[PDB]
Amino acid sequence: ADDIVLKAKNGDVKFPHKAHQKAVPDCKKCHEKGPGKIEGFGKEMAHGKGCKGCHEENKKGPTKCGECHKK
Ligand code: HEC
Numbered sequence: 054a055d056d057i058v059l060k061a062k063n064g065d066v067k068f069p070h071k072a073h074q075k076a077v078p079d080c081k082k083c084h085e086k087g088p089g090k091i092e093g094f095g096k097e098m099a100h101g102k103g104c105k106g107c108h109e110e111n112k113k114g115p116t117k118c119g120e121c122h123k124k
Pocket residue numbers: 054055056057068069070073074075077078079080081082083084
């Protein structure tokens with residue numbers, strides 16, 4: 054399947070799946086989550102545990118604005 058881009062107004066955010074599969078071998082961090090996770094995602098999640106927060110705990114991955122958002 055293809056990578057996805059979240060169409061944030063301030064700049065497109067790429068989600069590269071292969072990097073994540075490799076770096077977070079614990080698949081259950083993202084997969085087999087209960088119902089509602091598609092409807093639940095948004096700016097709060099992205100800037101929290103949905104993207105940024107995981108990067109911060111793992112000590113690797115983009116945490117600055119321009120590292121996620123790119124026109
Ligand atoms: C969040 C950070 C994820 C982690 C960790 C893993 N997966 Fe994932 N997966 C995630 C998304 C948002 C999507 C759809 C968007 C995309 O970029 O593809 C997927 C997709 C898959 C698929 C289908 C395509 C593919 O992987 O080749 C599979 C089979 C899949 N995910 C499995 C998988 C496994 C086995 C993981 C751990 C080793 C894993 N993913 C991590 C989000 C995230």
